Each structure stands twice: as structure tokens, then as C-alpha cells.
Amino acid sequence: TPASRYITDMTIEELSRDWFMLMPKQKVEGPLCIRIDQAIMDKNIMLKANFSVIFDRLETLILLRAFTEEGAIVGEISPLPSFPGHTIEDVKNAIGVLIGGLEWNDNTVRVSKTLQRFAWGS
Amino acid sequence: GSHMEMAGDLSAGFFMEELNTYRQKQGVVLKYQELPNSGPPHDRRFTFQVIIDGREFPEGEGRSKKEAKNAAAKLAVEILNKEKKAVSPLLLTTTNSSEGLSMGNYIGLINRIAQKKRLTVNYEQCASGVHGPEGFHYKCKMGQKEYSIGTGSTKQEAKQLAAKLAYLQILSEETGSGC
């Protein structure tokens, strides 16, 4: 799990931020996590994780959270596990569905970053 | 006008079956539109109208043979390429133009909104603990005539009210000219 093939985005502070749900909104198709709060909608979510790579491709994921400059949160996003864990090609859908939630109200959605580069592809 | 001029399958459609490619994303299941050999000044060019977006006249044509209908979808390559330029004004005129959950803090953008005259915005207290809440009358400012002021019992329950009243001063203050 070298740093050349394992990257620690989230520091020791991005791990345990909690916030509270006015009216959340959830959806999922496969191994990704999705959320928008509908009263607290369109806040900055900073989804960082300690991921890994191999051959410029998939090794793993941990979790993702929400952060702004002010520090608020609209919801939560992460690479979800499943029966096989996190299917790469299903991340095409799980991250796939994870891209278009809030987009109806002209405010773009947040997506998970781990399964993007190596699961959401292939 | 003409992309190909000689093509043609011999067991398939061609201008519908071999014509399947670009209309995957351009998205047109043509209940087909036919403008073949429409030239008024003596031109029989097959504009067997393939479509770019759902009604349009993709068209480029040269003769009533393999020449013509191919460059029908000539511009049905393009109007997706063309027109990628903007459509909206400064924002979408949509009834849902950007959300974003505007700031809940007060003294944050107060100094911004102190742009009324670029004010001295300042806050201080002497928080008694004698009896513990013994008395906290607050004295600060935004604006320059309504000295932002608060009053309360316990500290954090009353820490802002002047500074709240500060941040909520200038937008009501007629000041900025001196009186």
C-alpha cells in the first residue's frame, strides 16, 4: 500500500464531522453513498478518503464526508459497500446515480471520489 | 452537401440501419421525414431527411443517387457541435437558480457590509461572574448613529445582541453622509 499507490486525502481531522438533517434526500444504485438535505441543500461537501491505486487503477476506498469554507454540510457521500463490497462497474451507477441528485434545482450534486477514478471507470 | 457519394450496403438498411450511429446521443427515432429530390430549379437530390434534434432538416445533397442523402446528417453532426455556446443570462431564468444556504454568521460579512462607509467594527466585553450572570449590557457598533447595544443575563446567551445589532445596523442606517 505505497503512497505511490495509496493516497491519504483525508487527514486526521476530516474523519469525524457530524451535522444534522433538516430534510435529507437519498438515492443509490450500487456501491456508493449519496445524500442531500432538502432544507440544507447545496452546501460544500469535501469528500476526502485514504484511497489506494495499482497500475494507475483500483485498489480501495475508506469513506467520505462533507466540508465547506464556512464548514457547513448539505449531506453525506461515500463509496458504499455491497455483497461483493464495491463493484467497480456498479460504481458507474453508484457514482453514476451519485452525480445527478440536486441537479434539478440548478445546484450540482456531490459524488464520491474513491470509486470514481478506478471503479466509476470500468 | 456530400459526405459520401457512392456508399450502400447490400443486406441491411443503409440510411436507417447503417444510419444508427450519431442518433444514439442526438436521440432521434425518426418516424422518417422524407424530402427526396426537392430541388425546384431542376435538381433531383435525395434529401431523405435525417434529423439532428427532432424536426430539423439535416440536409446536404448532390444527386438522385448515392450522392445525396448522406450529407443530410452533415449538419446533424454539427448542431450538437455548434450551439454549445451559452443560452442563459447571468443566471438561469429557471425558478430554481442557484441555492447555497446563505451565511448564518453576523460579524463575518459585517465588515463587508461595513462598506456603507468602511466602518470601524469592534466588540469587547467585561463578562462579570460576580453572581455569575450579574449583568451584561452590551455596547458596540456598526453604523455611526445607532450604537449597537445589547443586554442580557448570561454571557453566550447575550454575547451577540449588540454585535448582532451591529451587523443588523447599517442596512437600516441612513448614515454614510454624517448625520
Question: Which of B98, B103, B105 shows the shortest C-beta gap to A107?
Answer: B98
Beta bridge partners of A37: A24
Beta strands across the sheet bearing A57-60: A6-8, A50-54, A57-60
User: Are B99 and A72 a contacting pair at CB < 8 A?
Assistant: no
Cβ contact (<8 Å) for A105 and B96? Answer: yes
CA B57 to CA B82: how far, in whole Å? 15
Measure the CA–CA gap between B152 and B45, rounded to whole angstroms.
87
Cβ atoms within 10 Å, residue A13: 9
Measured CA to CA, the distance from residue A46 to residue A40 in angstroms comes to 15
Q: In degrees rounded to 5, what are phi and psi of residue A46?
A: -110, 95
Q: How is residue B6 written as a grid cell?
A: 457512392
List, by residue range, all CATH 3.30.160.20 domains of chain B.
1-85, 104-179
- B128 to each of B44, B123, B160, how far by Cα in Å? 97, 16, 16
Q: Do A107 and B99 touch (CB under 8 A)?
A: yes
Q: H or E element: which one contains A92?
A: helix A88-97
Minimum distance, in Å, between the CA of residue B87 and any CA atom of chain A:
14
Helices marked H in B47-173 — which ranges? 110-113, 155-158, 161-167
Beta-bridged to residue B100, according to DSSP, are none
Report the C-alpha gap between B95 and B82 in whole angstroms: 27
Which helix (DSSP H) or strand (DSSP E) does residue B50 occupy? none
Radius of gyration of chain A (CA): 14
Specify the amino acid at residue B131: H
CA distance A45 to A66: 4
- CA-based nearest residue in chain A for residue B104: A70
List of domains in chain A: 1-122 (3.30.420.330)
| Residue A88 near residue A115 (C-beta atoms within 8 A) | yes
Q: Cβ distance B8 to B17 under 8 Å?
A: no
Instruction: Judge contact between B88 and B95, C-beta under 8 A.
Output: no
Shortest CA distance to A86 belongs to which of A43, A54, A51? Answer: A51
Broken C–N links (> 2.5 Å) in chain A, after residues: none
**From the candidates A38, A105, A108, which should be mutated to test the interface with B, based on the most B CB atoms within 10 A?**
A105
Measured CA to CA in angstroms, residue B109 lies from A95, B66, B90, B170 at distances of: 36, 68, 24, 12
B156 vs B95: CA distance, rounded Å? 39
**Fold adopted by B104-179:** Double Stranded RNA Binding Domain (3.30.160)
Handedness of CA B58, B63, B65, B67 (dihedral sign): negative
Matching residue, cell 503512497? A3
Nearest to B96 among A40, A72, A106 (CB): A106
Tell me the chain A residues in contact with residue B100 when contact means C-beta distances shorter than 8 Å: 42-43, 107
Asked if A86 contacts A79 with a C-beta cutoff of 8 angstroms, the reply is yes
**Closest C-alpha among B12, B20, B50 to residue B32:** B50
**DSSP SS3 for A33:** strand
The CATH number that domain B1-85 falls under is 3.30.160.20
Q: How far apart are CA B179 and CA B175, in angstroms?
A: 6
Q: Residue B31 — φ and ψ, nearest 5°?
A: -75, 95
Beta strands (DSSP E) in chain B are 35-36, 46-47, 136-139, 149-152
Is there a contact between A99 and A109 (Cβ–Cβ < 8 Å)?
yes
Q: Alpha-carbon distance B155 to B134, whole Å?
A: 10
Are B99 and A104 in contact (CB < 8 Å)?
no
- What's CA A86's distance to the chain center, in Å? 12
Q: Which chain A residues are within 8 Å of B94, Cβ to Cβ? A: 106
| Type and span of the H or E element at B55 | none
Q: C-alpha cell of B118?
A: 468602511
Q: Is A37 helix (H, G, I), strand (E, B) or coil?
A: strand
